[PDB]
Amino acid sequence: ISNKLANIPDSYFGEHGPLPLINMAVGIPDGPTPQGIIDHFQKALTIPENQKYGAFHGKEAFKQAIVDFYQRQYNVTLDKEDEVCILYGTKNGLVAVPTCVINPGDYVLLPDPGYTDYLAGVLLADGKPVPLNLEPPHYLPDWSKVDSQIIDKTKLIYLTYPNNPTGSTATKEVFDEAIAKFKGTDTKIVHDFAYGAFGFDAKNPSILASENGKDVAIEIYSLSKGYNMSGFRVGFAVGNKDMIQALKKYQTHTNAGMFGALQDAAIYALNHYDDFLEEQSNVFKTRRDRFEAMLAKADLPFVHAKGGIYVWLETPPGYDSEQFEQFLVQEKSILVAPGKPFGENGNRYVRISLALDDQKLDEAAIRLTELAYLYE
């Protein structure tokens, strides 16, 4: 094995107690792909151009469905050539960014608590990952608290709103502040918008809808959660021309274009399923309302979720995230995601996925409320 790869901690998500298992460690809604997307994929398989190698950077109709989506969704004007890069699932693009953008020894700020997969990308590019310390209840950056020396050396920053695992959301103004802090520096921003569709009390803002957003940032959007297409492996990067062009160049070397039929299904999804995205957000909103109501009534301490598909729950005293994870699976047959892999600041929380039977979730709630005595 190479030294570079040896450095990389295993993908943390790469047995149960007596009770029937409830797996609340799941990303991703439980629902099927809308039938219309399925029907169009089925049809796209019979198309001669779809069976064969195509243009590396994607169909014109795909690039166009992307800019159209961003325009009517976020009033963001994008150029199809300069400001759009199709991704083979967003994980692939997110982990590619540092290789494309930074040089050995460059500092990269990573949200703590934040998403697990970024670290690998930084390490694959010989960068130096440094935590962006986010604090409850709202987990927003505090740029004045980042060491002045680190800010100066930072060439890339990941942001994630809605945040995985904390469910925290951003506003136009918090993006304004980030952009103003780093415009005219060599620091760029990657905003991971995987949960863009899931905004409970307010539609989540794009970083690119903030004035000057494209000057500092790209935004990465996934079809996985919004459209129940997680297994399909399709997303896109949008924004800063320089960053987009570097990604595009990287993908001409590591890939030979996206499956044409997958592109057509993606086009169909983006063009026709705005209402469904709304439906998805609403379904998780109430799922959240019911689950957090159960928790609050039994005085279990949690951080209220503002978007995404999870609740960020405190561990009780005398349990860390991994001890509480093992407790819940052993005693309660509830699988949760421990806060630890999400960063140091996740040490005393667990992540709970609401992406299961609107049924199951109720039994899981009653199971958890029984543990109220642990929090005294």
Ligand X SMILES: *Cc1c(COP(=O)(O)O)cnc(C)c1O
Size of the site for ligand X (CB under 6 A): 15
- Count the neighbouring beta carbons within 10 Å of the beta carbon of residue 207: 28
Please state the φ and ψ torsions of residue 21, each to the nearest 5 degrees: -70, 135
CB 296 to ligand X: min, Å: 25
Q: Is 32 helix (H, G, I), strand (E, B) or coil?
A: coil
SS (H, E, C) 143-164: HHHCCHHHHHHEEEEEECCCCC
8 binds, among its own copies, ligand X, none (CB under 5 to 8 A by kind): its own copies
Residue of 141, 196, 213, 235 that binds ligand X (CB under 6 A): 235
20 binds, among ligand X, its own copies, none (CB under 5 to 8 A by kind): none
Residues whose CB is less than 8 angstroms from the CB of residue 3 and which lie 6 or more positions away in sequence, other chains included: none
180 binds, among its own copies, ligand X, none (CB under 5 to 8 A by kind): none
CB-based contact 47:264 (threshold 8 Å): yes
Kindly identify the residues of this chain, within the stretch 82-121, that bind ligand X according to CB under 6 A.
89-91, 94, 115
Count H helices, E strands: the chain? 14, 13
- Judged by beta carbon, residue 205 or residue 343, the one nearer its own copies is 343
- 334 beta partners: 22
CB 315 to its own copies: min, Å: 26
Residues whose CB is less than 8 angstroms from the CB of residue 195 and which lie 6 or more positions away in sequence, other chains included: 162, 164, 204, 225, 307, 308, 309
Interaction pattern, residues 248-287, with ligand X; x per rule: CB under 6 A: --------x-------------------------------
- Judged by beta carbon, residue 91 or residue 288, the one nearer ligand X is 91
**What's at 248, amino acid-wise?**
K
260 binds, among ligand X, its own copies, none (CB under 5 to 8 A by kind): its own copies
Say which residue the tokens 């460059």 belong to. 106
Interaction pattern, residues 195-234, with ligand X; x per rule: CB under 6 A: ---------------------------x-x-----x----
116 binds, among its own copies, ligand X, none (CB under 5 to 8 A by kind): none
**According to DSSP H, which parts of 45-89 are helical?**
48-51, 60-74
115 binds, among its own copies, ligand X, none (CB under 5 to 8 A by kind): ligand X
Please state the φ and ψ torsions of residue 330, each to the nearest 5 degrees: -65, -55
Residues forming the site for its own copies (CB under 8 A): 1-5, 8, 10-11, 14, 27-28, 32-33, 38, 41-42, 45-46, 48-54, 56, 88-89, 91-92, 95-96, 99-103, 117, 120-121, 124-125, 224, 228-233, 242, 245-246, 249-250, 252-262
Residues whose CB is less than 8 angstroms from the CB of residue 376 and which lie 6 or more positions away in sequence, other chains included: none
- Judged by beta carbon, residue 32 or residue 184, the one nearer its own copies is 32
CB 144 to its own copies: min, Å: 29
Distance between CA 208 and CA 71 in Å, rounded? 11
CB-based contact 268:37 (threshold 8 Å): yes
194 binds, among its own copies, ligand X, none (CB under 5 to 8 A by kind): ligand X
Can you read off the two tokens belonging to residue 374? 């642990």
- Judged by beta carbon, residue 94 or residue 238, the one nearer ligand X is 94
Peptide bond into 113 cis (omega under 30): yes
164 binds, among its own copies, ligand X, none (CB under 5 to 8 A by kind): ligand X
**What's at 139, amino acid-wise?**
Y
CB 203 to ligand X: min, Å: 18
Distance between CA 227 and CA 266 in Å, rounded? 9
**What's at 253, amino acid-wise?**
H
Interaction pattern, residues 133-172, with ligand X; x per rule: CB under 6 A: ---------------------------x---x--------
Interface residues with ligand X (CB under 6 A) are 27, 89-91, 94, 115, 160, 164, 192, 194, 222, 224, 230, 235, 256
